[PDB]
Amino acid sequence: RQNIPLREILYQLSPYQQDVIRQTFTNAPKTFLRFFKEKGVGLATFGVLFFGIKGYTEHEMHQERLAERY
Amino acid sequence: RMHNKIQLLSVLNTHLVAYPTPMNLNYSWNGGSLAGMMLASQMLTGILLAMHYVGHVDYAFASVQHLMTDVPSGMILRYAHANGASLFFIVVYLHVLRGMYYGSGAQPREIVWISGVVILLVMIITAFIGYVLPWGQMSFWGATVITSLATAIPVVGKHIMYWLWGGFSVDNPTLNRFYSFHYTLPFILAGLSVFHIAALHQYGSTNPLGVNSQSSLISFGSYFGAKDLVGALFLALVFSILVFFYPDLLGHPDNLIPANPYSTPQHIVPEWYFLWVYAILRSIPNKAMGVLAIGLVFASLFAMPFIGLGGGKFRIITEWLYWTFLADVLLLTWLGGNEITPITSFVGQCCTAYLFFYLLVCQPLVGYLETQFAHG
Amino acid sequence: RMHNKIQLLSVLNTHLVAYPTPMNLNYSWNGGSLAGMMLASQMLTGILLAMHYVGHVDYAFASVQHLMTDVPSGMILRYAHANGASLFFIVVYLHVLRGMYYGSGAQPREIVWISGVVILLVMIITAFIGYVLPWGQMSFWGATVITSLATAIPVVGKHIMYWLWGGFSVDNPTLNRFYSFHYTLPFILAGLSVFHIAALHQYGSTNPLGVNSQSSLISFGSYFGAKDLVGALFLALVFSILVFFYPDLLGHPDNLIPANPYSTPQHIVPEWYFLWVYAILRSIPNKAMGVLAIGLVFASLFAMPFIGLGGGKFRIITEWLYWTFLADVLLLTWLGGNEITPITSFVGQCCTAYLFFYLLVCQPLVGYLETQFAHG
Amino acid sequence: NEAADGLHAPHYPWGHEGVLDSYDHAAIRRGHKVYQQVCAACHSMQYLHWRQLVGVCYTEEEAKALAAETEVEDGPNDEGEMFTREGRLFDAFPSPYANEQAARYANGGAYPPDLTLISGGRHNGPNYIFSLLTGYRDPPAGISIREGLYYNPYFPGGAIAMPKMLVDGGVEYEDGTPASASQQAKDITTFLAWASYPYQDEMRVMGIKACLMISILIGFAAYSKRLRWAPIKSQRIVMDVVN
Amino acid sequence: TSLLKQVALPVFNSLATTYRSVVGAKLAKYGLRFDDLQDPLKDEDVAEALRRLPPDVVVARNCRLRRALDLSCKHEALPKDLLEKQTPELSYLQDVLNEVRAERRERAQLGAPAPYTRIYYD
Amino acid sequence: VEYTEDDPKPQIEEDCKPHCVKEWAAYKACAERIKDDTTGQAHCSGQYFDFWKCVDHCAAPKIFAHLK
Amino acid sequence: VMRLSEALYQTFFKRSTVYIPMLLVGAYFSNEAIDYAVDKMWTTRNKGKLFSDIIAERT
Amino acid sequence: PIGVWSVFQGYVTPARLPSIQTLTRVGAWGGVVVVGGLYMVQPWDWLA
Ligand SMILES: CCCCCCCCCCCCCCCCCC(=O)OC[C@H](COP(=O)(O)O)OC(=O)CCCCCCCCCCCCCCCCC
Ligand code: HEC
Ligand code: HEM
């Protein structure tokens, strides 16, 4: 099953010799900031393009409705 | 040892229990299990609803109402089916966008991408003919508008239209044949899903790093069963909220009026998951050109594993253009729900042109430039 | 090779083109491909039928009549779907009798036999609830007589019965759920057929000589394609005769009367392929004992690979006893269409006793005596 | 076009809007009485039965007495003829007309639609219904209305065939509530909102239980996921590669 | 085109150096190199170039990929002392791969195919 | 609060009308400017809708305060 | 740090045929408690609006 | 990759492309599809 040549030492601890969810509270703000640091540019360019084009379209639609008035 | 004695134990053990999987898969690799679970949910709730639905134009709406009020747990089943269709499309669309972001269709996984595009086309047809079954105003008039696109084909257009209708208009034979086709096509979806999954198990999954992962593989059953359970519970929360608190949020109020072939609604719109195709169709002032543009969109989806270069995080120009593509498809979704207007026609035309530009110009050429930048 | 580069072509080549098969198989090894062809024909005709059938009381009979006289090619489709059930059962029964004659379920093909027995049970349930659908007198009264036999299990009787009916008698909920269950069960039949064929391919087929045939194997796809085509053409001739010349020969004239819950017909008998079980049930003067005997027949069928010793020729005592068993089963088939008479009750009791005697006493003990005679 | 769209209706503070809130069952009872005395002269509500009002709106005996005051066609008898009888619990609400065509003929060509699902069958359902019932205003300049039609800016197109039907004191409530036009409109809008979603309270109770259970199970499943993945997330790999 | 294509190459070189700076900053946190981003399953020439290599180079490449995948599972980066030593642009594969691709281009002008196929499993 | 047999909604709607004097002025300007029309197509439904949307948004929570 | 007791382990945890009935009785009582809490909160919030409040008021 | 990567890597040459005789004999299947469609539909006045 796909022999891989490799030289290493691997260590593993029992899952009943460590904690489960206690470190999740410590790392939660750091992980939040790291997520937004990594995906900040893409989410921002998505938001700018989508909301800008939607806002321009809705504004010009409102102007079109106003132009039909008497 | 015990699974070595029976074939069915051996196949299940190999492909579900001891299947090697990259250890660094994140939660973007849960869309497939969620899509399979939503297909199973749709099949179960549909089989249960079929015991009370009558596929006749005099009894369809009335049997829907009777199932809603008088059948025990019938409202839960009906709302679960109608909103599980939308959650099925959400999960599948996010799965496809994951594949588009990571370039997962590339070699040696062209068959997986092609069977995926086949699955998505079958899914679209299944949902469209299922929506006609309540026989409301939207159910009648959307089937009228969409099946009237066959007359864009010259010479033999009206003949194919009348052959599909069973008459000169959408009526009872259309509803009966749509019910039979709608009962049938989910089993083809189950077969296609089995083939699609068995195609992926030939080589394995890709990882978020985009590198070869054969040095770091762990068993699927012990590790990714729990990781899939977590995502299934997050999906069950959203499913519960949609079924019990906002059941008609993703629907239309006109489908609660019985069908009238002599008075059309003012705003005929589909379900939300067909709105981008509808915007592509409405943006072009020619029926044949609109149908051709939809066919070219799906041809570009088929041709992705052979024209697409460029993948995940380390290929940064295409990674930035992915978000522009995502904004474009959501703008197409929003534009479909709005009325015809010169500015919406212009913006829809520009958005369709950008979708074609991204699919056919950015993915080959920018991918080739970044391969030359990184390894030239 | 071109088939070595796509995994779909490799599986299809391995299991349909180059699969090694014994070269001395006679024409009694064509039962399985004929059964698969009949299953595919039933699925196609039914999916076509469901586009004109309405699964509601006060519309079902009229929809079948509109199918028969107004739908183009509708009479051919209905008569083909009705007589195809009979031909499907003829072919599957001859297949089972072949396996009984040759000892085909023995080691290592016990999974093949067990999956076959499961397929037969699902076929019986599918055919019964599909026979209820036209909503004639025979449909209603057979569904009444069979489903009101759950009042033999103590305490938990009429609760299960009323939950099956959706009410207090066979009515519109029973028909409406029977339509959904009948549409759904043949896909389970197709999946079980695929699993059944895949279980045989682990070890390959037996031969008429009953010896090891690993030395003399030839390709399936060239030699056994035309051999299956010949038998398929014979089956098509019989099928065409039944559809076009004697379409109502195997049926019952009472099923052309609309169902009346307040008037019962003089003689209530099922279709011919259910008649042997009906004779076993009707011969015993106790409902719970009749259901126990019906369950015991299928339990002895499941236990056949683990108790049955003895195959085809060169095992001549069990070979001769097979013909008494065949006569017994055909006698039970004849007795089910008669009236209840003391002589017919006595003869049916003797036939049921001999059926159990052959299945549970002759096959182990006479087979062991044959092994002690031949190799002792 | 704005005139074809009609005037949008404001958002009123309904007491059943929140996911924690039930219906006002006293208002359903008063809304049904507006239905019997004003609505039902020309509206059918063909998917309601008197059995469904029990435990929501009336007791069994009150609903039986209400149903027994209606004439229901039944048959055929042993002589093959059609007769009439007292309504019962399983009977549906009486329809004022036998068919759509006589309903159109009695109302100038316009068919008054069924009100069982009119609340969920309109955009912004209860608010539109209340504003339509209390909103028969004077037409603006340049808008003329033909005979047989009445102006209502909430109706799309502005020209409705339903006249003003709610009047002050036109219903005598049995709980002492004074019956102005707005109170009658609010009560019948509450009854119609119940008619579109008859199991909203039960659905919300089940949804609260489901959301609580799934939210606890999410934490338990996250715990069991992190327990299984802990020997991998904390493993130590040492190799000779430095790069 | 030749009049403007004389100086279109330094602009290409500047964009390539900026691209490699950004991506190599991204790669160095995982301990990867630019040549580790090439998959033998994705390209049969890379699969051919990888079997032309001495065994210690392949062992080092596998070790780096294993370390990066472990780091990706742990949602971590390399520590500062390891991160300052990372050399993302030290090639081990580009010469062999360039030779393989030149051989394949040479065989194709004479109508010959490459003497290898894709990696086929099962 | 005391519930009245008379309708409180017209009084509340009349009370909110000083809060929307600008839209009323725009509607009256429209009604004056199409006075000499002869084609039968000039109408002032949009400015009318603006004024009544303002009044409705004012008076909506104060209407249900007076109703049981 | 915190650790399951040995004597409580040997009784309700070592065999699955003892663990499963304990699981079912705990499931029953958990469902009863969740039903009680949800119903009490709903009836307290919507007091005076239900049908049973009107019926008990008319006594 | 095999589609456009092969064109960009210079692996698609005239000596590797199929011949004009091969393109003639492969493209002759177009008449088979036309006559198969005419056999299936029979939409002609061609029989006279
Ligand atoms: C006349 C009709 C009136 C209708 C009034 C209601 C219209 C819609 C509500 C108002 C929407 C405007 C603010 C929306 C804020 C949403 C959040 C957001 O953008 O954050 C995403 C995003 C968040 O990034 P993340 O937190 O990294 O995900 O924020 C940005 O990146 C900033 C986005 C700024 C770009 C959009 C600016 C507004 C476009 C208006 C264009 C007008 C063109 C005029 C041309 C004609 C002139 C004559
Ligand atoms: C004079 C007979 C009559 C009475 C009484 C009557 N309606 Fe109307 N109703 C009509 C007609 C006619 C229409 C349809 C008008 C049209 O579509 O142009 C209608 C329409 C409606 C509509 C739908 C409007 C729309 O936009 O589709 C509702 C809701 C409604 N009625 C409710 C009521 C209520 C509540 C009452 C009692 C206060 C009532 N009806 C009493 C004749 C009546
Ligand atoms: C074996 C599988 C299925 C069966 C038997 C089935 C059956 C039915 C039936 C009888 C209805 C009409 C009842 C009603 O309108 O509420 C219906 C509705 C519908 N089905 Fe399914 N279905 C199946 C699977 C699916 C799948 C896979 C989808 C995928 C999107 C789907 C989408 C829909 C939709 C959109 C509706 C319309 C719901 C509405 O608006 O009321 N169904 N289905």
Ligand code: HEM
């Ligand atoms: C009913 C629909 C589908 C089901 C049940 C399904 C199932 C799966 C599953 C279980 C996986 C493995 C893990 C994962 O990536 O989530 C997978 C992977 C994949 N799917 Fe889907 N899928 C469906 C639809 C699609 C569609 C519509 C597409 C594309 C158009 C697609 C393309 C892919 C690809 C390319 C992969 C491999 C991605 C990778 O491993 O990196 N699938 N699918």
Ligand code: HEM
């Ligand atoms: C729709 C129903 C069925 C299908 C499509 C099917 C299909 C097949 C096929 C294709 C074969 C290989 C060719 C042949 O020997 O005929 C086979 C063999 C066999 N089948 Fe069936 N079968 C069906 C029902 C059954 C049933 C009902 C039984 C037993 C109760 C059964 C038991 C067997 C056995 C024992 C063999 C192996 C025979 C031997 O190699 O000696 N099958 N089946």
Ligand code: HEM
């Ligand atoms: C997807 C598969 C199938 C579908 C959709 C289907 C559909 C139908 C329908 C709509 C009817 C009622 C119309 C009529 O009776 O003419 C019917 C009747 C019937 N079905 Fe099928 N069927 C399927 C497969 C089968 C199979 C596999 C069997 C037997 C093993 C079967 C046995 C019957 C029988 C005996 C009747 C009664 C026909 C009569 O007496 O008129 N069906 N089926």
Ligand SMILES: COC1=C(OC)C(=O)C(C/C=C(\C)CC/C=C(/C)CC/C=C(\C)CC/C=C(\C)CCC=C(C)C)=C(C)C1=O
């Ligand atoms: C690493 O990658 C992988 C995943 O991702 C993390 C996975 O998740 C899975 C597991 C796959 C799942 C859960 C998807 C479900 C699979 C399919 C094929 C969906 C279609 C199947 C259906 C709808 C079954 C329903 C039909 C039935 C039961 C037949 C009818 C019969 C009866 C009702 C009796 C695998 C193997 C995997 O390798």
Ligand SMILES: COC1=C(OC)C(=O)C(C/C=C(\C)CC/C=C(/C)CC/C=C(\C)CC/C=C(\C)CCC=C(C)C)=C(C)C1=O
């Ligand atoms: C309210 O309503 C409406 C819908 O609905 C919910 C819609 O979706 C759409 C628009 C949807 C689009 C453009 C995407 C989906 C498009 C198509 C063409 C769906 C495919 C269905 C077809 C052609 C019907 C024919 C059915 C067949 C062939 C049965 C399948 C069987 C076999 C192939 C053997 C609109 C406008 C609509 O207003």
Ligand SMILES: COC1=C(OC)C(=O)C(C/C=C(\C)CC/C=C(/C)CC/C=C(\C)CC/C=C(\C)CCC=C(C)C)=C(C)C1=O
């Ligand atoms: C005249 O009278 C008679 C009939 O009538 C025409 C008959 O046919 C039969 C033949 C029937 C027999 C022997 C029994 C059939 C077997 C079973 C198990 C009964 C059918 C069970 C039902 C309908 C329960 C509901 C279940 C359904 C619909 C499907 C279950 C779903 C799955 C397994 C996935 C006899 C004897 C008969 O004398």
Ligand SMILES: COC1=C(OC)C(=O)C(C/C=C(\C)CC/C=C(\C)CC/C=C(\C)CC/C=C(/C)CCC=C(C)C)=C(C)C1=O
């Ligand atoms: C002892 O030696 C053997 C035999 O004896 C000589 C056999 O006979 C067979 C099996 C024979 C087979 C598989 C052929 C018979 C056909 C079957 C079972 C299915 C019938 C299907 C037909 C005619 C066409 C169906 C068409 C379609 C389009 C359905 C597919 C659906 C989709 C693609 C969506 C085997 C394996 C064997 O070892």
